[PDB]
Amino acid sequence: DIQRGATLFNRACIACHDTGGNIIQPGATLFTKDLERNGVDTEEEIYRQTYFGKGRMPGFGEKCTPRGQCTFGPRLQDEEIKLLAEFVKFQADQGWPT
């Protein structure tokens, strides 16, 4: 559900990945070229990074561990992270339409 994925992305991701970008770390946007260069232009890789995190990208998964590498907010359920990974892949493929 793209409507549902957009809503969840808007509240859990968009402040950092504004319209597909990255306000913290240049080179690590959600655009296809950056995802590709970073080895993560697949739903499975997007899911894994969202779940466990990397660098200053917090992990959101329920079993993300250790505590310090994960969001200090609530964790996301597996189904939510799957929706988000699908949504990011779809948007990146589409070129992040505005």
Ligand code: HEC
């Ligand atoms: C909400 C759940 C999300 C989702 C789906 C993603 N993020 Fe982030 N992200 C942030 C930073 C600093 C990075 C770079 C980390 C590094 O260089 O080691 C990332 C990276 C990603 C990717 C990979 C992008 C790439 O081109 O390699 C993906 C798929 C991704 N994120 C998804 C920063 C943040 C945040 C700032 C506090 C927040 C919030 C999020 N990300 C949230 C999400």
